[PDB]
Each structure stands twice: as structure tokens, then as C-alpha cells.
Design a protein around this nucleic acid. Structure first.
Lengths: 258, 148, 100, 175
RNA sequence: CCGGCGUCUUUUGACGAACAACUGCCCUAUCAGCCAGCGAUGGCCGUGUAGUGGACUGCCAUGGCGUUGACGGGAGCGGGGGAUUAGGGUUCGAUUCCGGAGAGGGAGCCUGAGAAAUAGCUACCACUUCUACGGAGGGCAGCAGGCGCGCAAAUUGCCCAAUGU
RNA sequence: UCUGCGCAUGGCUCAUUACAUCAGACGUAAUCUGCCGCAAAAAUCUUGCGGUCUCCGCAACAUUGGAUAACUUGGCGAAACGCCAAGCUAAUACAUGAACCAACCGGAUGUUCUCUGUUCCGGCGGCAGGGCAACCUGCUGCCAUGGGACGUCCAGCGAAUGAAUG
């Protein structure tokens, strides 16, 4: 059982430094995996800057002033992965974490009624006792009584105001879809095709807007909406389009002349 | 029903543990083996089931066709080195390793053991396909899906 | 009197279950009378030396309990009553004690 | 202690493994439980899963089942006739999975006679039913041959199924 | 009338634990045959384990590996990486990160979800400390520090403010 | 001081070690998993009072029981992260135990009566005659592809076995 983590062996999507400190926090197990998560203390301290020190993050959280999933937390360490709404009511602000283009955690700011919306990808379906069907998700949530049309790897729109599931969205056909992991993170596009290799990983080919096709694993597909004009949730800072190295450098210079 | 003593030589008997075939019925009479109760299992990666498994008699608990033994990640190919042993064959893979300094390849072979289903009995020099199953002996991890 | 416990001239306790007129070394669990309850981790035994059940001339001290009481009073014991340290902290016990 | 490992064993090349590691508690044999006949005695052991498993000693009763009719009743284990593994086992009347055995047979008899509202149910069940001959002869006498299809050495319960024609005819001839 | 904690059992994601395998790895033939009484290779039935398995019992079969270097011996914790090189290469890796193993030498064990733990236990052996000698203890390859050793290596300091648990 | 949780992680050291260990890729449909997250939960005849046989009748925020440390008292031993007796008294420690509240789902059925099959190929029960006691003949009553009404027993989760489904 591991209870310690070193800064280098920790993700640098948390944007820790080589120098200053030796350890990084190992979060308590929860909805999300160690690599894909970002621990509370990291967010509050290094990004939002409502804390300058570890101890100050305990001060805020133990007390309680912070909610995720609309539930208040007294937890110092807790995962925050993907499609999680966090709300600090003291500020009155609602963040929705996502994957920004270029592999960065996005923190995107939402209207208040969008922060009751959430999207969870389904992993398995199975029948449990009493013939009661269950969809188990990638956040470990159990949706009792899902629709009879549910399949593995589809999204379920999930009301956090009161817990239930309205209409689903499938991974079928061309639909607006975004990537999770694999270093095509936050890049958005239509499904062009879904290749099958049975007994092995199923490739899928995505085509983003303004062309430039590419390939990513089925496992890394996470649906957004029916269409780009039917999206239920906001996009991060960049729209889900990447640009060439040359153009990055060019634009960096142009703005620096101001 | 009645015994088939062609199969049996054991002090334990042998039965198929998946499905009861020991029920007495006249529905196993006036038929070679087709009307007799069997268990059959598809392998869904494109390995078509033989006739033999489906209609057969043979009782084996270490082949995927008449047992709950399953086919998983790895699938490899290789020839027949020897047919020796009972329900166990010996496969020889051969491939090429590369050495950077001399910019030249070398031949290196893995001599491996496998559990050959009593359905198949390939001759020396034939090529075999073999899947990834749970351990079955000390050395044996594989099973014979198909034969060329 | 009923005999109860007592010790060797090396402080080592007598044990009712052990039978010896001598001292032997034995495995002694935490809950036994050779090793204290509160020492060490959960689920343990040690090796302590101690004395059996049978008495001899190696006894420094012997502890008893009065069962039947003679016609000759002995000071500090049958001439003296000492009250309870604490009364009951359970509800229902107060109802049995004052019979209310 | 006792271990289950390939690291005290010869390789396929006839060579010998060399060690660098002291044995784990993950790998861990324990001594075999001996289930016989006589008064039931059950000694638990704690296992790695955080739960207990029960060592059957001396089970003289089992929960037995009759094939084809989808039933079962308890009855008393009397004798062991046969076993695949050894003759030695049979003589001590040890009970381990796939021993042929002998049972009281009484409840099965009782049941099969029940197999005015009642009366016509019987006549319907008598119809489209038959039984093997070698079965019924034994079942008349009040003894039967069965197999113990649960492992009693790690559950401390002995359950068995009753032999039917195809398989019965084999074990019979081995005696 | 409502709120916040706490707990039993069941259920499955996560954090991990435990197995298995595809491919790769220094020198040596003045090391060429190696393996099966007591398991070597496999089949059959059981036993055991959290679980698969010659892991183990019984029965049966006679196999398994080798000049594409088995087997034995010598040197060595493994990798990421360091040094040097126009290129190809050459050489190093005890050591910050990751993985494995160990706590004087060995073995056995309890508890626990997880240990064959060693600033936990039991025994033996090599050492070693107290005792009015009836007995009782000790394990720095944790930080300082001492002795020994060798060409060779720091203070018996201050602090939980920071970074983590 | 009892109780709960952690102390198996970090730290330090390279002795063993070449189909070992490790690195990249891969499987565990062959398994375990505290803390954490999202969740699930309808078995349970109990409590109190009155009479009274260990039996009934009522009533229903359920009104449960018994010890052990610190402590006190006597102490022991050269010393010991060595220990003893007696008296105390706690619980989210330990041991008991929840009717009513209570939905829904079936099977086994009963010597309960109500419709019923306007007939005879069959069965069962009773009586009479003959009998080799195996059996036959005659007569009477009931049932035969049916559903209601009423009574009784088993029914939950987890685990074992057989059978059906998947």
C-alpha cells in the first residue's frame, strides 16, 4: 500500500516544480485514477490562489466552503478528474474542469444551470439482483434503471440537482466527440469511422473541423453531443483545434510586441 | 443411458461436466453420436469450430471447444517439432533478431510446449495456431485453436 | 480460605493452570497471568518464566479470600468495612439499588 | 512454511533455480483436512481474503440430490465403496470429491410415492416418466450409490449427486 | 420538526496486492552433454491455495532441453541515465527517480485488508550487555557519534516555518 | 485509561542473483482488496403491565443484560519496556434483541365445500358370493385434462449442491 508520492513520479499536468519540496500529495482513492486526477490542494493553492500553503488548504476544506458534485466536502484530498463541477459558493463561482487543447487541465466557467448538468461515460452495463439493471460509469457512479437502449461507451446526461438520468447520447455514427488521454487531449471532432479489431484495441478515426484526420483508441472516446450546435456543455479556451509549431511561435511573438 | 467403453480406460470414469449427458433417453439410440448431448463453445476471433467438437464423443477438460477454457490476449504461430506425449505437442517458433553494430540479423527459435486438443493431430512440419489460456501444466500455457 | 495467587522470591507469579512445584518457561499470551494485557501489539505471545500451581518454600507471599469466617476477628479485614469507590453509571442499576 | 512455488524445482533444461528471496506468506500451503465418517467436527481457519474456510472432519451426513427430477433431500453417509485416487482412502472411508459412496436412501423412496386433489396430480406425473432398472432395484432395498460432487475439505459440507444409468453402469462394474 | 457525524452486511469502481507470458541482456568449451530412487516432461482423478498450476499426493505414459551454446564456473542488483566519440561506436551505472531484495547469520509464527514485519514475536548459531549470580536483556545497512578498516570521505547542531505523511 | 485508526508506507543499504531480476508491450473469463466514492437494505415475534400454570388478555419514540481498565486496598522482586490478590465502576468494548410498521413474487398443498364433465376406455374406497389367497364376478359412492372460496407450510440478502433458463 502506497502512501507517499514524489514530485517527479507525480504528473506534471499538476505543474509541480523539480525544486521546492520533495513530496507531492497522493490523493485518497475515489472516482478517478491517479494519473488522470488532480488533487484539491493543487487546485486551490497553485491555480486559484486562495491559499499560499498546504495548511491553508486544510483550513478551507475541513471547515467546508467547497462543493463538488453539489455535495459539500470535508475531505482534504479528493480526486477531481473530468466533467466535474466544483463550486465555491463564497465567491459564487462554478468551475467545470475539462481537458484543454495541448494536454492541459482546463478550468472553464459556466452559467449556474449548466453546473447542474454533468456527463458520465458508461463502461459496463449488467443486471444486478431483483433483475435491477445497472450502468456502472467511469466515475464509479451507479445509475439504477438506465434506458433499455444503453450500451458500453455511451454518455448519460446526469442531473446533479436531483439524481437521475435524462436522455442518453450514443457513440454511434458521426457525432461531436472529444478525446480523453493519449495526448490528443481536448481535441474535438466528428467520428469518421470506427474500426474493429476483436481481441485487441478498437481503433477509431476522428476528423476535426478544418480537416486534418487522425486516429485514437475507442477507449479514449468520450461523447459530447449530437452535433456541434446541439452541445450541452461548454468548450475550453481553444475550440478543440490544434495548430502547427510555426504558428504557435509566430503568435507568441506578435502579442509580445504589445 | 449406456456406457461407451471405447473412450473409457480410467478408474475415475470420464464425464462432461458442463452439461449432463448421462441421462437415459432413447434419443441417443439409432444415431452415431449426433443425437448425443454435447457442449460446444465458439471462439469469436475468427476461429471456426470443427465438426468433431460439436458432434463428437471425446471428453477433455483442457481444450476451449468442450470446456470453459478461454482464449485471451496472445495468439502466435509455429510449426510442429514433435508429436510426442499424450494430448501435448511441441511447437517451434522461429524469428529474426537484429544486431545494430553488424547491421545483420540472426536466427533464434523458441521451443515451446502446448496442449493439443484430441480433435487435432497435425503431422511434423505442419503449421499450427495457438492461443493464450490459463496454465494447464508447468510449461503449458497454450492450446491449439486451428491447424493448417 | 480459598487460595488464589501469590509469587516466587523473584517476583514470578503462580499459575493455576500450570502444574509444577518448580519454575518452567512457557509461552504466555497477553490475556494470561504471566504477562500484562496492555503490553505489545494485537495478537502476540512471549516467553516468560513463572511458577506452577503447587506450593513449596519458595513462596514470598500468598493471597487468599475468606470464605467462612471464624470466631476470632482479624484486624483490618473483618473489623473494617470500606465503601465502594464509585456508584453505578448505568440507568437501570440505579433502579435496582434504591429499589424505585 | 509450506509454499507453492516453481523456485525449488528444476527447469525444463534440467538446471536448478537459484534464490535471492525469502519465501512469501502469499504463497502458502496448508496441511490437508481429513474428512471421514463419525461425529461432525468443524475447525475454521482464517484465510487471506479476510474470511474463514471450514475444515470438514468426520462428516457422516450429506445433502444428496436425485438427477433428472430436480430434487434433493438429506440422508446419512454409510460407507465408501470406491475412489479413483487410491484403495487406501476407501478403507478408511475418507470423503473427498468424486468418491462413490452409499446412502440411507429412505427420503427418496418416500418422495417418489408422492411423485383427492392430490390423487390426479400423481396420475399425471406417473405419465411420461420412467426410471432405470439398476436404480430401482437398489432404491427398493434401501441403499443407493451416489457421488460427492462438493469438496468437503474446505467447506465442511458434503453434497452429492446420485448416479444415473450411463455412469452408474461403469462404477458398478469396477466393483 | 429538521441538520451533521458513526457503524453492520451486501454490491463495484478506485488505490494496491499476488500470479503468468511475448521480446531483449557480460565473459568462459583447457565447462558438452544436462534432467527422473526422493518429479524430470506430459496425461488422468483428487488435495491445497484468495486463485491458476507437478504447487502437492496417488495412478498411468516416456518424455523434456542442447553448438541458434544447454549445463557448470567467474564477474555484477536491474532500468531510466553518466563519461567520451564527426559518424559508427567505446566504456560506466554503489548512489537522489522507478522496480526488486535485505535488516548479525538462518528458520518458524501471530495479528492484520495487506507482513513470513525485525526500533513485532519464538528458537538455534556467531557475538554482546546488566545481576547482592535466584535471574534479566541487546541487533545503527534509521540521524548524529564511537571503534575497526582502507589510498579515501562532515555536527552526538537548529526547526516542524516550508514540502508530505 | 479503555475504545477506534495508523505504524507493512517513508528512510537506509546492494549481500544473494543469468530463462533470476528488470525494461517495453500484454493477460488474469485464474484471484484477494481496509481506508475512499457512487450505492443498495421489507427474513427476524420483541418490549411493558395485569391476572395467571411455565397461560392468556391488553398496551407499544423498545423501557436490554452482564464485566473490565484507570482508581482504591494489600503487595512481590537484586534488577527487569517484570508481575500478583481482593474491592470498584463506564461504552460506538462485549453479549442480547426489535412484534406492529410490511409492499411484491411464487411453489408444496389439505381427508374444508362450491360450481362440474347429460360417457366409459381407467383408477380408488366399501359390501356380498366363490377362491389355488395369486384372483375373478355383481352392486353402490367419488375423481378424470376444469376455477373459485377457505385453511395450512415453505419464501429475504450472502454462501454450498443438483436441475431449468441465460
Amino acid at each position: 500500500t502506497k502512501k507517499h508520492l514524489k514530485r517527479l513520479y507525480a504528473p506534471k499536468d499538476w505543474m509541480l516544480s523539480k525544486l521546492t519540496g520533495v513530496f507531492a500529495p497522493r490523493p485518497r482513492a475515489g472516482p478517478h485514477k491517479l494519473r488522470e486526477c488532480m488533487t484539491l490542494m493543487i487546485i486551490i493553492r497553485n491555480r486559484l490562489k486562495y491559499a499560499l500553503n498546504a495548511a491553508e488548504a486544510q483550513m478551507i476544506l475541513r471547515q467546508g466552503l467547497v462543493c463538488v458534485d453539489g455535495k459539500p466536502r470535508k475531505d482534504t484530498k479528493y480526486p477531481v478528474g473530468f466533467m466535474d463541477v466544483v463550486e465555491i459558493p463564497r465567491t459564487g463561482d462554478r468551475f467545470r474542469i475539462l481537458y484543454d487543447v495541448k494536454g492541459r487541465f482546463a478550468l472553464v466557467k459556466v452559467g449556474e444551470a449548466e453546473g447542474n448538468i454533468k456527463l458520465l461515460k458508461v463502461e459496463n452495463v449488467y443486471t444486478s439482483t431483483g433483475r435491477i439493471p445497472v450502468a456502472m460509469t467511469h466515475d464509479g457512479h451507479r445509475i439504477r434503471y438506465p434506458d433499455p437502449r444503453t450500451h458500453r461507451g455511451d454518455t448519460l446526461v446526469y442531473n446533479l440537482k436531483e439524481k437521475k438520468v435524462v436522455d442518453l447520447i450514443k457513440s454511434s455514427n458521426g457525432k461531436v466527440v472529444m478525446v480523453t488521454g493519449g495526448a490528443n487531449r481536448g481535441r474535438i471532432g466528428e467520428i469518421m469511422s470506427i474500426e474493429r479489431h476483436p481481441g485487441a484495441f478498437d481503433i477509431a478515426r476522428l476528423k476535426d473541423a478544418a480537416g486534418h484526420e487522425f486516429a485514437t483508441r475507442a477507449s479514449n472516446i468520450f461523447v459530447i453531443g449530437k452535433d456541434m450546435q446541439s452541445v450541452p456543455v461548454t468548450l475550453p479556451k481553444q475550440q478543440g483545434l490544434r495548430i502547427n509549431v510555426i504558428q504557435e511561435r509566430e503568435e507568441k511573438l506578435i502579442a509580445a510586441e504589445a | 443411458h449406456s456406457v461407451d467403453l471405447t473412450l473409457q480406460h480410467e478408474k475415475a470414469y470420464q464425464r462432461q461436466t458442463a452439461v449432463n449427458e448421462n441421462s437415459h433417453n432413447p434419443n441417443k439410440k439409432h444415431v452415431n453420436m449426433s443425437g448425443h448431448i454435447r457442449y460446444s463453445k465458439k471462439i469469436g476471433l475468427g476461429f471456426k469450430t470443427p465438426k468433431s467438437a460439436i458432434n463428437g464423443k471425446y471428453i477433455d477438460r483442457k481444450c476451449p471447444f468442450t470446456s470453459d477454457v478461454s482464449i485471451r490476449g496472445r495468439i502466435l504461430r509455429g510449426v510442429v517439432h514433435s508429436t510426442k506425449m499424450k494430448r501435448s505437442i511441441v511447437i517451434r517458433r522461429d524469428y529474426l533478431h537484429f544486431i545494430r553494430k553488424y547491421q545483420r540479423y540472426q536466427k533464434r527459435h523458441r521451443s515451446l510446449t502446448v496442449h493439443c486438443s484430441p480433435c487435432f493431430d497435425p503431422k511434423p512440419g505442419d503449421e499450427v495456431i495457438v492461443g493464450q489460456c490459463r496454465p494447464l501444466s508447468k510449461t503449458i500455457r497454450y492450446n491449439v485453436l486451428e491447424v493448417v | 480460605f480459598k487460595l488464589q495467587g501469590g509469587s516466587d522470591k523473584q517476583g514470578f507469579p503462580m499459575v493455576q493452570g500450570v502444574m509444577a512445584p518448580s519454575r518452567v518457561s512457557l509461552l504466555v499470551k497477553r490475556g494470561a497471568v504471566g504477562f500484562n494485557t496492555f503490553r505489545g501489539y494485537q495478537g502476540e505471545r512471549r516467553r516468560k518464566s513463572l511458577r506452577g500451581c503447587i506450593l513449596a518454600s519458595d513462596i514470598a507471599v500468598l493471597n487468599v479470600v475468606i470464605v467462612k469466617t471464624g470466631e476470632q476477628p482479624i484486624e483490618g479485614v473483618t473489623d473494617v468495612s470500606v465503601p465502594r469507590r464509585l456508584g453505578p453509571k448505568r440507568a437501570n442499576k440505579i433502579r435496582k439499588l434504591f429499589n424505585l | 512454511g509450506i509454499v507453492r512455488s516453481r523456485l525449488h524445482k528444476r527447469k525444463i533444461t534440467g538446471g536448478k533455480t537459484k534464490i535471492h528471496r525469502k519465501r512469501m506468506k502469499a504463497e502458502l500451503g496448508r496441511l490437508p483436512a481429513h474428512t471421514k465418517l463419525g461425529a461432525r467436527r468443524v475447525s475454521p481457519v482464517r484465510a487471506r481474503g479476510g474470511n474463514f474456510k471450514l475444515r470438514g472432519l468426520r462428516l457422516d451426513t450429506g445433502n444428496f440430490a436425485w438427477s433428472t427430477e430436480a430434487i434433493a433431500q438429506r440422508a446419512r453417509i454409510l460407507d465408501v465403496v470406491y475412489n479413483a485416487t487410491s484403495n487406501e482412502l476407501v478403507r478408511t472411508k475418507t470423503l473427498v470429491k468424486n468418491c462413490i459412496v452409499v446412502v440411507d436412501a429412505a427420503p427418496f423412496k418416500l418422495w417418489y410415492a408422492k411423485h383427492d386433489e392430490l390423487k390426479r396430480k400423481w396420475m399425471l406425473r406417473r405419465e411420461n416418466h420412467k426410471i432405470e432398472k439398476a436404480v430401482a432395484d437398489q432404491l427398493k432395498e434401501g441403499r443407493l450409490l451416489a457421488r460427492i460432487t462438493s469438496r468437503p475439505g474446505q467447506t465442511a459440507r458434503a453434497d452429492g449427486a446420485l448416479l444415473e444409468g450411463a455412469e452408474l453402469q461403469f462404477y458398478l462394474k469396477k466393483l
